[PDB]
């Protein structure tokens, strides 16, 4: 265990590289990536048709990927959506350089 | 109906005989009603559905057997290779390429690949 | 592994005057035939 | 996003409501233009898709 | 502290997991616990029914020993250099019948080959005493088997092993070969490890798809069951073997992860290859020469067996608890019992009663044929707490066959009773 690897893992989780890692892990279990893309698209279409009002700020495709990751034993936030606890107040948005 | 009013669950053999009789006569809808009655009674309906489609094929009711097989495949049930071959061969001999191709697609989805026999049967109509 | 068969065939050829007439000919409720252009006027 | 008038009209409604956008099946206005032009040049063009199920030819206009 | 099958055993050494871990072997959700019988795999997390399989084990290809089945012998874990006479020994074998010889030679060379994972993994392998295979068995055990066919086959296999060792490992052989198996007992133990822990799977590496016989570490520590919870799937992109739990099955903490070897074989093949026997084997066959025939449909009805003859299971949903007499034993009975099916003709009670009484007479005859009883076998088993594993396996096989015959008798009696309702 390296002692000074807290901020790196924190930034990896916050930025969204978890999505890339999960995509690579889910493509390492598929022969043809095009059929995987079509399957994910169909599942996201079913999710959208089931609950329209649920989405709009939460992505159905990210929700499908998070469900597939959670069903594989790896804990992932629902649709990879996280909120900033250190937000100053309403109407204040962070500036990502 | 008397046995059911008696409060006793009917045996699987009774429902099998009823399904066979309905398939021999050609009453596919009553056969499906019996299958649903077996399903709500927690009985397994795979063997009864196979006997039903086989009797419907034998009773010359090809389209009824085809739609019953399609309903069973949509339900999630599986079929034996002999049922696949019989359905495909009869549909190709009659001239119905659409149902034959649909049954072939359902078979390949179920895990069983197609051999030269099914392709020759399909080409018999395609030519 | 039966493939998903998609069959689309575009076709081109010389058209008879009957077809180029039927592309324009229409029968109004009164019974006249419209489609013929006979005057150079545009507007 | 370019030429399909109906689809484009439906895109705004589907996005505002939130429903899934269906895949367009009709030919774009560019193809229809070509057909009209070529038929002004006395040349025909028909889509003529054939169903693999029942071996029937269906013209797309 | 809830009582669980894992709790009764003790946890294994940390090192056993560690040697694999530093080499990329990964385990998710499972624990390795050692016991008197040997190592086993147990769950450490509650898994609800899943839509798709979950990977508990990821085993890389660089820790495995793999030999192709067909004539071109391709070692994808290529630890054998070119020109080595061990390949001359391996190739001088019949391609179809004898495959354990090549695996044994490969395992011996891997034990000899430096910086190999199997050099460290062999310490955890069962020793000659711990091994339960009948190749490492005395004539007393084969005589106690009370089965002439199985004893003869095992003696013939031992003779084949000895003859192969005496032919290939002669005095004029080079020292690099001689150091592999200096004594024939080492070669017999290698053949035992190869036979008892072989996996036959189809693997794809690069562009080549082939079928091969592989010795995979950490996947042979899973016990056998006829209702498996996991299966051996292959991943070609990462070139790893993955063990995945069956989809739609609920696994609770403390359960034992199990896989199926030889799905559809009798206890004879199990006792021959793995030195194991199960009383609930659903594929056991009992040869009955009686002219009597029971009714198959009424039997499956009274015993609540549903499905095609190729797939039999107890519908416990219709069972409503209660009947637990139903198990793989009655399924194997219904499979082996002589049965008659003639359309929808209803069975006759008198004919079926005569049939079941004739079957009970024949079963009592077959039970009297063995010069022992279930109580005597159980007493001999409990009388010897520590003894040879082969003798224990033999007496367990005898007890399992006797219990199977007794349960067949009891099932016929229950059928005769319940048919008249």
UniProtKB/Swiss-Prot annotation, chain D:
Transmembrane segments: none
Top-level taxon in the UniProt lineage: Eukaryota
Coiled-coil regions listed in the entry: none
Quaternary context: In plastids the minimal PEP RNA polymerase catalytic core is composed of four subunits: alpha, beta, beta', and beta''. When a (nuclear-encoded) sigma factor is associated with the core the holoenzyme is formed, which can initiate transcription.
Its job: DNA-dependent RNA polymerase catalyzes the transcription of DNA into RNA using the four ribonucleoside triphosphates as substrates.
Family, similarity comment: Belongs to the RNA polymerase beta chain family.
Name of the protein in question: DNA-directed RNA polymerase subunit beta
Species name: Nicotiana tabacum (Common tobacco)
């Amino acid at each position: 265990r390296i002692p000074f690897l807290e901020e790196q893992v924190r930034k990896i989780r916050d930025g969204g590289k978890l999505l890339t890692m999960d995509i690579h892990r889910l493509l390492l279990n598929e022969d043809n990536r095009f059929d995987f893309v079509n399957e994910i698209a169909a599942e996201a279409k079913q999710y959208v048709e089931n609950n329209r009002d649920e989405y709009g700020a939460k992505k159905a495709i990210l929700h499908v990927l998070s469900n597939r990751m959670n069903d594989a034993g790896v804990y992932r936030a629902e649709a990879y959506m996280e909120s900033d606890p250190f937000k100053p107040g309403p109407g204040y948005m962070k500036d990502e350089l | 109906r008397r046995e059911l009013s008696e409060g006793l669950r009917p045996l699987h053999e009774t429902f099998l005989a009823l399904v066979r009789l309905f398939g021999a006569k050609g009453l596919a809808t009553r056969g499906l009603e019996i299958l649903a009655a077996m399903e709500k009674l927690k009985y397994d309906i795979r063997q009864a559905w196979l006997v039903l489609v086989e009797e419907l094929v034998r009773s010359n009711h090809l389209e009824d057997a085809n739609k019953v097989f399609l309903k069973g495949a949509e339900g999630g049930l599986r079929a034996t290779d002999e049922i696949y071959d019989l359905l495909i061969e009869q549909d190709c001999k009659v001239g119905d390429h659409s149902n034959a191709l649909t049954i072939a697609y359902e078979m390949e989805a179920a895990g069983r690949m197609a051999t030269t026999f099914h392709f020759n049967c399909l080409l018999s109509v395609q030519a | 592994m039966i493939d998903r068969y998609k069959h689309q065939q575009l076709r081109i050829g010389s058209v008879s005057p009957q077809q180029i007439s039927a592309w324009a000919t229409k029968i109004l409720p009164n019974g006249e035939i419209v489609g013929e252009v006979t005057k150079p006027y545009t507007f | 996003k370019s030429d399909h008038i109906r689809a484009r009209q439906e895109v705004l409604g589907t996005t505002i409501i939130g429903g899934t956008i269906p895949n367009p099946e009709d030919a774009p206005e560019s193809f229809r233009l070509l057909v009209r032009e070529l038929r002004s040049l006395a040349l025909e063009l028909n889509h003529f898709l054939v169903s693999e199920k029942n071996f029937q030819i269906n013209r797309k206009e | 502290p809830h009582d669980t099958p894992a709790s009764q055993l003790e946890l294994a050494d940390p090192d056993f997991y560690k040697i694999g871990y530093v080499r990329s072997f990964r385990a998710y959700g499972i624990e390795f616990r050692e016991g008197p019988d040997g190592y086993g795999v147990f769950a450490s997390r509650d898994v609800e029914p899943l839509r798709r399989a979950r990977v508990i084990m990821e085993i890389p290809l660089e820790l495995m020993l793999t030999i192709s089945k067909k004539l071109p012998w391709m070692f994808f874990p290529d630890i054998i250099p070119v020109g080595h006479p061990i390949f001359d020994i391996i190739n001088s074998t019949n391609p179809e019948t004898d495959s354990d010889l090549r695996l044994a030679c490969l395992l011996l060379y891997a034990f000899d080959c430096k910086d190999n994972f199997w050099q460290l993994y062999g310490d955890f392998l069962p020793s000659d005493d711990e091994c339960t295979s009948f190749l490492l068995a005395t004539e007393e055990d084969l005589l106690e088997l009370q089965d002439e066919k199985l004893a003869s086959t095992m003696r013939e296999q031992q003779q084949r092993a000895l003859e192969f060792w005496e032919k290939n490992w002669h005095s004029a052989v080079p020292l690099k070969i001689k150091r592999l198996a200096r004594d024939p007992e080492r070669f017999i133990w290698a053949m035992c490890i190869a036979q008892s822990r072989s996996i036959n799977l189809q693997m794809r590496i690069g562009a080549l798809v082939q079928d091969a016989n592989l010795l995979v570490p950490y996947a042979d520590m899973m016990n056998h069951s006829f209702q498996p919870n996991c299966f051996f799937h292959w991943r070609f992109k990462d070139r790893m073997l993955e063990v995945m739990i069956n989809a739609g099955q609920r696994i609770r903490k403390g359960d034992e992860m199990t896989v199926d070897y030889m799905a559809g074989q009798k206890n004879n093949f199990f006792m021959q290859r793995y030195g194991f026997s199960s009383p609930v084997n659903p594929w056991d066959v009992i040869h009955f020469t009686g002219d009597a025939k029971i009714h198959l449909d009424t039997f499956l009805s009274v015993f609540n067996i549903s499905g095609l003859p190729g797939e039999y299971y107890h519908n416990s949903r219709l069972s409503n608890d209660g009947d637990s007499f139903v198990d793989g034993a009655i399924i194997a009975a219904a499979r082996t019992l002589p049965t008659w099916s003639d359309g929808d003709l209803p069975p006759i009670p008198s004919l079926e009663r005569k049939a079941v009484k004739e079957l009970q007479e024949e079963c009592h005859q077959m039970l009297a044929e063995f010069p022992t009883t279930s109580d005597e076998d159980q007493k001999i088993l409990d009388s010897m707490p520590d003894c040879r594993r082969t003798l224990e396996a033999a007496i367990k096989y005898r007890l399992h066959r006797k219990l199977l015959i007794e349960k067949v008798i009891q099932a016929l009696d229950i059928y005769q009773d319940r048919i008249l309702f």
